[PDB]
Design goal:
five-stranded mixed beta sheet, globular, binds alpha-D-glucopyranose, binds the ligand CCOP(=O)(Cn1ccc(NC(=O)c2cc(Oc3cnc(C(=O)N4CCC4)cn3)cc(OC(C)C)c2)n1)OCC, alpha/beta
């Protein structure tokens, strides 16, 4: 009963989800205004991706996705045929700890490997780059890294042109040639990839290691950009929502602990409630509190349970996947150096559920804010929209998307939302934006 009382702190009322949604809407309006942009927690970064007429260039497009690293070859043929090939690459700590130069040298090396395994190192291809970090764009192929997120810390990157860093590393290597045609956020790439299959897709969302959304905003509303005709995609960077104290009445001890011990204290607070980088850690801290209060594992925690990041977000998914026999739960805890009881297993499950349900409900508040804002901007009484979604939390968590879809739909009564689970959106969309941008780019000279 004391266990249940502690887990009940994660609960959120429909009245406070509505408070969060309206606060997100207020923060979104702030990010778009020239007057409040520099102070605004939700940056609402213009992407330079504009509503496009039918079709794109036909051909072979290379895609890079950083934010594991992925190289993708996308074949666009002609009605339309889109075929993909991919390779995954694990980033070594050295490439993460050092310079931006070392990071882009390892990315270049991965590109060479992909080119050799696909018998194409002699081909000079157009390249789309998904770079899943806040970027101030000057165009579709030029953007400066505002700051790292999700524990990324390579020196000499912030304030520099990310496209320039990649081009330099390709030149230093001298093993292949590529035309870097576009750089997009993963939300943007996901939206573009799902748009290919559904033209009503005007929102891209990520629920992975981090959490973010982008959407098609009226050009009239984008004050940081010249023009009043059509629409442009805006990268909300909503992970930073709560950084100017917007979420203070909702933050728990476990949230402030995760934040204090993170690579970016005081930053990405909304994200820190939802993202897979943080989810497992919130659970480990809830479990440690139960152990300290002698309510779980007879007050005896292991050296492994006491280590930061030892409770992987994958364990949270696995725990909530458990059939009922508690065998999955027992095995995770046994490997973690613990000897749990059956009751201990049930406690671990309930803690996992408390953290993930809060993540889904917090996430739905943000997405509803975006959809409700668009409905107003488009003066649509009944707005029919598609949301393209990528990320391991949304895709692989046992009940996250069910809990998330219902909560979004309760906050959006006047909307008909379709959710597309994007299989390879983050990577595929970088190539498709390149294919669309290449109608103009390949003719610049
Ligand atoms: C559009 C013109 O704007 P610009 O000023 C900036 N700019 C450069 C790119 C760019 N916009 C886009 O990439 C772009 C691409 C979109 O997704 C696709 C996917 N597939 C095909 C397709 O038909 N396919 C058949 C095979 C795939 C087409 N579009 C959707 C989109 O908006 C909607 C979400 C409203 C914008 N804007 O162009 C100059 C570079
Ligand atoms: O990877 C999902 C998201 O993670 C973080 O929130 C990044 O700041 C954002 O740019 C990205 O879209």
């Amino acid at each position: 009963t004391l266990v249940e009382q502690i887990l009940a702190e994660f609960q959120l009322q429909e009245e406070d989800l509505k408070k969060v949604m309206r606060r997100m809407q207020k923060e979104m309006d702030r990010g778009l205004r020239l007057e409040t942009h520099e102070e605004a927690s939700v940056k609402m970064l213009p992407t330079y991706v504009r509503s496009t007429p039918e079709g794109s260039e036909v051909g072979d497009f290379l895609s890079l996705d950083l934010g594991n690293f992925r190289v993708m070859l996308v074949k666009v043929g002609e009605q339309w045929s889109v075929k993909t090939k991919h390779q995954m690459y694990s980033i070594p700590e050295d490439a993460m700890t050092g310079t931006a130069e070392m990071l882009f040298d390892y990315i270049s090396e991965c590109i060479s490997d992909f080119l050799d395994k696909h018998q194409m190192k002699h081909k000079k291809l157009p390249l789309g780059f998904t770079f899943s970090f806040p970027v101030r764009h000057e165009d579709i192929d030029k953007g400066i890294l505002l700051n790292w997120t999700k524990g990324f810390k390579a020196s000499g990157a912030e304030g520099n042109n990310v496209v320039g860093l990649l081009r330099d590393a390709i030149k230093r290597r001298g093993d292949f040639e590529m035309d870097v045609v576009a750089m997009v956020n993963d939300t943007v790439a996901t939206m573009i990839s799902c748009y290919y299959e559904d033209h009503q897709c005007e929102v891209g969302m990520i629920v992975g290691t981090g959490c973010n959304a982008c959407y098609m905003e009226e050009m009239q509303n984008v004050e940081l950009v010249e023009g009043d005709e059509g629409r442009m995609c805006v990268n909300t960077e909503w992970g930073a929502f709560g950084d100017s104290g917007e979420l203070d009445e909702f933050l728990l001890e476990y949230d402030r602990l995760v934040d204090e011990s993170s690579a970016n204290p005081g930053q990405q607070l909304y994200e820190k409630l939802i993202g897979g980088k943080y989810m497992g850690e919130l659970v480990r801290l809830v479990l440690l509190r139960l152990v300290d209060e002698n309510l779980l594992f007879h007050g005896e925690a292991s050296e492994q349970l006491r280590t930061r990041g030892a409770f992987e977000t994958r364990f949270v998914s696995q725990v909530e996947s458990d059939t009922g026999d508690r065998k999955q739960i027992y095995n995770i805890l046994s490997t973690l150096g613990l000897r749990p009881s059956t009751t201990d297993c049930d406690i671990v499950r309930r803690a996992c559920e408390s953290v993930s349900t809060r993540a889904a409900h917090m996430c739905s508040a943000g997405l509803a804010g975006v959809i409700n804002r668009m409905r107003e901007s488009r003066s649509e009484d009944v707005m029919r929209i598609t949301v393209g979604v990528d990320g391991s939390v949304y895709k692989l968590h046992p009940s996250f998307k069910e809990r998330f879809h219902a909560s979004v739909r309760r906050l959006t009564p006047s909307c008909e939302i379709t959710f597309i689970e994007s299989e390879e959106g983050s990577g595929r969309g970088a190539a498709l934006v390149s294919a669309v941008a290449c109608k103009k780019a390949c003719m610049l000279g």
